[PDB]
Structure 1
Amino acid sequence: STLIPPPSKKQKKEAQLPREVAIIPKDLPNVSIKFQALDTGDNVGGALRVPGAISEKQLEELLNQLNGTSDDPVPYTFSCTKTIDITDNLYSSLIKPGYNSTEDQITLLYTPRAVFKVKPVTRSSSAIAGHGSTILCSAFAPHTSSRMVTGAGDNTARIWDCDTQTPMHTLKGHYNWVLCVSWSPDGEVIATGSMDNTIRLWDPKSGQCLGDALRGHSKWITSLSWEPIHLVKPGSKPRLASSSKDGTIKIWDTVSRVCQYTMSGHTNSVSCVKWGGQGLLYSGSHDRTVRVWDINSQGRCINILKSHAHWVNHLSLSTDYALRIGAFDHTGKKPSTPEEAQKKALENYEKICKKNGNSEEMMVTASDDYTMFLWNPLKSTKPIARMTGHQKLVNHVAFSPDGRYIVSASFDNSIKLWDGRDGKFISTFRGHVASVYQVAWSSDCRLLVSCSKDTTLKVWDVRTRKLSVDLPGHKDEVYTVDWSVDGKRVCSGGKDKMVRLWTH
């Protein structure tokens, strides 16, 4: 094993020398600061003088008292413009490095954060067997973290109980490889789209198949999306959109188990379909185009976006986490009535959708031309930004659950972090020695997990922009990874025919 060079004799003498102590001064003068929001740029109080030894919690309470919301405070983070975040106190964060003097003002930008915290996963809970072939897709239940669905190449899916790390149900309806699995946003039905151009619906509690399979596609299913709960009328079940290799997006109403619309504008294989929160659908396909359809206009193609020089491999939405989670939260609370479920889903969607004046739903498309494009398809037809820097194709892309960051996993053994609003480049996550297949965020937007061809997972801290923990254990390539809604478990699977569950 190759080791870093040892310290020299002079360095050992310097180590044996006594150390300085970073203590807070007592005669520290008052500092003038100006509050400003990151999303809106609104100034609170103008220039206010605070003690130089102000702590982050006391500054948060001061901001809450300025806003008039001390009764129900919301935890925020602070940054200062080179932008430096506030770790412990103002003196150590800014004054101790000496970048800003006491006489000069300090412009503090505040950004809301999550009340809860997710601890990083540091070990494997279990390595569960059962599948006969390579594992292709995995997903967690939205309501609970104890249910995981995994579809593999042995023409089967499996429902695993995450509390005991044991298999619970086996789904054996399909005839060919189960390419994609998905859970309903209300947690009622699991949809499996397979290699044999079919889709099957399953009740997970009984582990049973609901009627016959959905048929009509001529080639294998590529992606599945569900209608958002906040758009579904109460008392109704969400519809299922499916993309496939044949170039068509089919919409299925599961109440009558029929097909309503068959969008057919693409001339090549549709890579992915996503059902947004404003009654629109976005499809990325191998004909270098992204098609924007309207569900309210008989499935007509509203727009065609053409800016890529190769296949668009993946797309993501700003509110994608909210659309996937539906009405549930990180605490696993279940609404009593469909009306309450619809209202809670609407609030969860709006908290990400409507901000900084007008409600916007940004989209990001990652393609085989080594690049990504950031769009705002509602207001404009041109792309808002172009993200470049990857030396190989960008296989996966994901918005943060708060919609403030974009993470792109490419085939050049790298991940890249970009701003979620204007698409400016932030940082590079390095450490994988093979191509990164896919990525996943944590619930509080502070941790990231990625699976790679080098048989390893990696957990990264977004704030410090560095690797947190490397997770080996898989015997071969890891194809699918997911993080639970409560941020307690991580599931992974690949060519070793084993489901790896990881916990803190």
Structure 2
Amino acid sequence: GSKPNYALKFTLAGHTKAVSSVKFSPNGEWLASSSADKLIKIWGAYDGKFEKTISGHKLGISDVAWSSDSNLLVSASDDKTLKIWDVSSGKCLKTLKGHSNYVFCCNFNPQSNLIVSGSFDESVRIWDVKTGKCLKTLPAHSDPVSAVHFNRDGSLIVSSSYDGLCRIWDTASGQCLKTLIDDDNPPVSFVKFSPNGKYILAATLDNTLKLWDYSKGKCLKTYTGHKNEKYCIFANFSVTGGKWIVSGSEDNLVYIWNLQTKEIVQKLQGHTDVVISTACHPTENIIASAALENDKTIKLWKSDC
């Protein structure tokens, strides 16, 4: 149909502090959750079935991300490290050391030979997955780095910061290609490339999501009606059915907009705290949502459209 009809299917309990992020495995099999409780949990994507806990970080985790082949995870922790995990064995393969403050955000490149990280230390780091060596340190920002993401061919990195900037980096050289957002304020709390790599979705802490044309460097769409003044809340392109934008919200709801029209097409109610993270299943019309410490649950929602 023209609108989605996401309905609650499962509630996933077990984290003992705020959930920080949820991500679907590229192969659709799994949901991974990270939490302030220092743990990663793996869940069945379709039935919410608890699979395993992955442990090792000495402090809370802000983010977790999947390799392209669904075999590895990378986590970003307040212990100033990232850890690369074998999902099958649950073992830590590498500890990525070099950040001087909390590591907030992380992603594999499509090749999954590199990891990008952003930290409270105001740097972006590019790591070799095989060796766990830091290849490049980018002096990217003048305040904590809120998000990092590679584009579809891995040639570009997009970063965002509380400094109010969105910057695009050449992966090979680490050199800045452009400053896409150049305001003193507000803080840019989230950024990611569109599936096709032509657009950047950016959240600012003035209750606003914006879709930017990367090449032209101008704003194509604005999404409002949600609450976002404090937290680095993820946002998604939903592509399996209708073409939506999905975001959590500080009013404890998930918001879904029509990408083209910018109209809100659904609000998902159930969480009892800030929805910090949403993920869209790679093949099925399924949303995962995760909430802060008054809730500490993950919800799986499914839609016919």
Q: Same fold (TM over 0.5)?
A: yes
Give the counterpart of 1:218 among 58, 69, 86.
58
Aligned AA (2:54): L
- Please state how far the C-alpha of 1:461 moved relative to its aligned partner: 3.0
Higher Cα Rg, which structure? 1
Residue number among 289, 292, 299 corresponding to 2:126 in the alignment: 292
Give matches, 1:206-285, under 5 Å.
207-210=49-52, 213-229=53-69, 238-278=71-111, 279-285=113-119
Q: Secondary structure at the match of 2:176?
A: coil
Q: Structure 1 CA distance, aligned partners of 2:50 and 2:268?
A: 33
In the alignment, the residues of structure 1 paired with residue 80 and residue 303 of structure 2 have an alpha-carbon distance, to the nearest angstrom, of 37
Alpha-carbon offset, residue 244 of structure 1: 0.6
Instruction: Give 2:249's aligned residue.
Output: 452
- For 1:480, which of 277, 283, 286 is the aligned residue? 277
Counterparts in 2 of 1:503 and 1:121: CA distance versus 1, 3 Å: farther
User: Is 1:317 aligned with 2:150?
Assistant: yes
2:262 is paired with a residue whose SS is: strand
Q: Is the 8 A contact 1:227 1:240 kept in 2?
A: yes
Q: Please tell me whether the aligned partners of residues 247 and 277 of structure 2 are also in contact (alpha carbons under 8 angstroms).
A: no
Match among 180, 194, 197 for residue 38 of structure 2: 197
CA distance in 2 between counterparts of 1:470 and 1:396 reads 22
1:433 CA drift (Å): 6.2
> 5 Å matches for 1:156-171?
165=9, 167=10
What secondary structure sits across from 2:54 in the alignment? coil
Size of the alignment, in residue pairs?
291
Q: C-alpha displacement at 1:428, in angstroms?
A: 4.5
Of Structure 1 and Structure 2, which has the larger fraction of its residues in helix?
Answer: 1
Change (3 A) 1:189 1:365: same
Instruction: Measure the CA separation in 2 of the matches of 1:457 and 1:189.
Output: 23
Structure 2 counterpart of 1:443: 239
Shift of the 451–389 alpha-carbon distance from structure 1 to 2, 3 Å rule, reads farther
Using the TM superposition, give the Cα deviation of residue 255 of structure 1 relative to its aligned residue in structure 2, in angstroms: 4.5
Q: What are the ranges of 5 or more consecutive residues in structure 1 without an aligned counterpart?
A: 1-118, 129-164, 230-236, 320-352, 354-359
Shift of 1:426: 2.8
Residue in structure 1 matched with residue 164 of structure 2 by the alignment: 370
Q: Equivalents in 2 of 1:258, 1:438: separation in Å?
A: 27
Residue 104 of structure 1 corresponds to none
**What SS is found at the alignment partner of 2:22?**
strand
For 2:66, give the aligned amino acid. W
CA contact (8 A) 2:6 2:268 kept: no
Q: Structure 2 matches for 1:98-109, cutoff 5 A? A: none
Matched AA of 1:434? K
The percent of aligned pairs where both chains have the same amino acid is: 26
The corresponding residue for 1:105 is none
Listed one character per residue, the Cα deviations across residues 362-390 of structure 1 (whole Å, up to 9, x for unaligned) are 11001101111011211x22210002255
Over 3 Å counting, the alpha-carbon distance change for 1:248 and 1:478 in structure 2 is closer
Q: How much is the aligned-residue C-alpha RMSD, in angstroms? A: 3.3
Indicate the residue corresponding to 1:412 in structure 2.
Answer: 206
Deviation of the 1:245 alpha carbon: 0.8
Structure 2 distance, partners of 1:310, 1:192, is 26
Distance in 1 (alpha carbons) for counterparts of 2:48 and 2:189: 35
Residue of structure 1 equivalent to 2:3: 121
Counterpart secondary structure, 2:186: coil
Shift in Å, 1:467: 1.9
> Are 2:20 and 1:179 equivalent residues in the alignment?
yes
Q: Which of the pair is proportionally richer in strand?
A: 2
Q: State the 1:225 CA deviation.
A: 1.8
Say if 2:78 and 2:102, in contact at 8 Å, map to a contact too. Answer: yes
Q: Is the 8 A contact 1:121 1:459 kept in 2?
A: no
Contact 1:458 1:467 in 2 (8 A): no
TM-score by length of structure 2 reads 0.80
Alpha carbons 2:41, 2:54 under 8 Å: kept: yes
The offset of 1:432, in angstroms, is 2.5
Match of 1:399 among 166, 188, 193: 193
Q: Which has the higher contact order (CA 8 A, sep 6+)?
A: 2
Q: 1: CA distance between counterparts of 2:156 and 2:141?
A: 17
